[PDB]
Amino acid sequence: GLMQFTLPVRLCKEIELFHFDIGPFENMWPGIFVYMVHRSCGTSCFELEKLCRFIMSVKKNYRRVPYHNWKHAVTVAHCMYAILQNNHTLFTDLERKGLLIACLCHDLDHRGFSNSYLQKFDHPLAALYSTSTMEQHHFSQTVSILQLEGHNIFSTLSSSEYEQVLEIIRKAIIATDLALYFGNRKQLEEMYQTGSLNLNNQSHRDRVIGLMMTACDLCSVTKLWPVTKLTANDIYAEFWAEGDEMKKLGIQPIPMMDRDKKDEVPQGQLGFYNAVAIPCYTTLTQILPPTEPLLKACRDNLSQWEKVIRGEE
Ligand SMILES: [C]N1[N][C]C(C(=O)[N][C]C2=N[C][C]O2)=C1C(=O)[N]C1=NC2=N([C]C(C3=[C][C]=[C][C]=[C]3)=N2)[C]=[C]1
Numbered sequence: 001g002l003m004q005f006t007l008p009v010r011l012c013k014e015i016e017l018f019h020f021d022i023g024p025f026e027n028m029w030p031g032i033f034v035y036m037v038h039r040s041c042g043t044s045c046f047e048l049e050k051l052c053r054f055i056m057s058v059k060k061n062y063r064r065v066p067y068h069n070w071k072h073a074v075t076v077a078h079c080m081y082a083i084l085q086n087n088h089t090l091f092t093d094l095e096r097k098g099l100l101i102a103c104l105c106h107d108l109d110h111r112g113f114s115n116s117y118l119q120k121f122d123h124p125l126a127a128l129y130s131t132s133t134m135e136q137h138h139f140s141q142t143v144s145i146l147q148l149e150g151h152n153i154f155s156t157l158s159s160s161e162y163e164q165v166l167e168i169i170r171k172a173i174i175a176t177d178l179a180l181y182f183g184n185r186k187q188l189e190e191m192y193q194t195g196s197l198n199l200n201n202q203s204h205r206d207r208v209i210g211l212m213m214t215a216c217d218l219c220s221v222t223k224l225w226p227v228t229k230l231t232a233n234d235i236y237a238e239f240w241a242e243g244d245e246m247k248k249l250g251i252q253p254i255p256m257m258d259r260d261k262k263d264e265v266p267q268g269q270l271g272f273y274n275a276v277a278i279p280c281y282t283t284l285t286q287i288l289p290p291t292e293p294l295l296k297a298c299r300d301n302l303s304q305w306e307k308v309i310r311g312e313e
Pocket residue numbers: 178218220221228229231232233235255256257261262263264265266267268269271272
């Protein structure tokens with residue numbers, strides 16, 4: 001019980017900041033996550049034997065795809081850790097528990113193809129789950145891993161606490177479907193402006209956790225420019241593979257997925273930053289003021305893409 005994970009000094013300091021990169025040493029990523037659980041949650045939150053077994057089985061169920069891989073999972077959990085650590089008193093013990101686990105599991109068994117491609121391929125998952133196809137799959141994979149012998153990290157919760165945390169996880173993972181983000185953010189926008197936003201209202205908390213999940217999910221745009229720029233190559237390697245697979249079904253893909261249109265990536269990143277990323281981190285910062293560093297880094301990266309376009313890089 002007296003066994004802390006500890007990190008080298010540079011990581012011990014940098015892990016607290018929103019723009020932390022977890023590094024290229026895959027074998028340190030489980031320890032980093034357990035470190036983040038122990039500080040966010042407590043050393044008592046999980047049996048270490050059970051947590052370590054859960055983590056290794058989650059790792060094994062991410063695939064070797066360029067972007068939606070085990071690295072993304074730990075990265076997305078770290079951004080949640082940093083939100084939770086900058087908003088100590090806003091979240092319950094059950095929420096702190098659920099959200100780190102939700103972020104770690106949120107893209108389980110991703111194949112590097114969007115919901116649209118699954119529907120166009122007529123994949124069996126698109127028959128089983130008509131909307132939020134992959135996300136319903138990610139949550140399905142999370143429940144399966146929780147039910148493997150020795151992997152039930154929530155075994156010590158009361159029945160009703162267990163139903164509540166699985167409900168926090170289901171809604172957190174469903175919320176990573178960016179098709180749902182547009183409406184969720186607009187409703188949060190209205191609610192904050194008219195002053196109806198109430199964090200004692202569960203339906204409002206659920207909306208706020210949704211936006212946190214989108215923010216953590218998109219957090220590649222909140223890193224230092226060298227990280228954002230090199231992660232962009234990984235995001236596009238998937239998009240362009242999906243484009244290729246569209247052309248093999250006889251469908252012209254959108255330009256974002258057509259490798260023949262790589263030239264326009266800079267203007268494509270602007271659109272994304274203006275239509276999704278900035279609105280996301282703006283409303284997050286209005287609801288949760290200590291998350292302002294994510295909006296600041298997002299805007300620094302917008303200004304870097306503006307420089308790429310002007311030929312200065
Ligand atoms: C979903 N998602 N997630 C994440 C992302 C990113 O992306 N994010 C970002 C990042 N950074 C780093 C990493 O990641 C996204 C998107 O969507 N994006 C996007 N992109 C693009 N668009 C368009 C384009 C184009 C390209 C080319 C041509 C034309 C057009 N591109 C839209 C959207």
